[PDB]
Amino acid sequence: KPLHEQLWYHGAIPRAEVAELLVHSGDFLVRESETVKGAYALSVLWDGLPRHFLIQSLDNLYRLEGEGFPSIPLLIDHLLSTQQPLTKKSGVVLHRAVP
């Protein structure tokens, strides 16, 4: 389905509204980056601190560190279903798609 129909996708929203929507550790959403042209960010509350990961792509695969997926929803689904860290160094984990 379209990115804009995904449960966790909030489009172009201001930081004030992201900070209000992410309430507990593991809460996350996907949004447009304000400062990186055309880019998406995965924003996750982790240990009291909002964390923002630019969703990268290479060879038509979306990814944060390891090998990626053909779409952003497939990447999110993988992270949410496996509870594997977004990157090795960060240790951040997705738990709740904020609707």
């Binding site: 964390r51 923002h52 990961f53 630019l54 990157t87 160094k89």
Partner: peptide, 6 residues
């Protein structure tokens, strides 16, 4: 800093 490494 705002975004994680790329």
């Amino acid at each position: 800093p705002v975004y994680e490494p790329v």
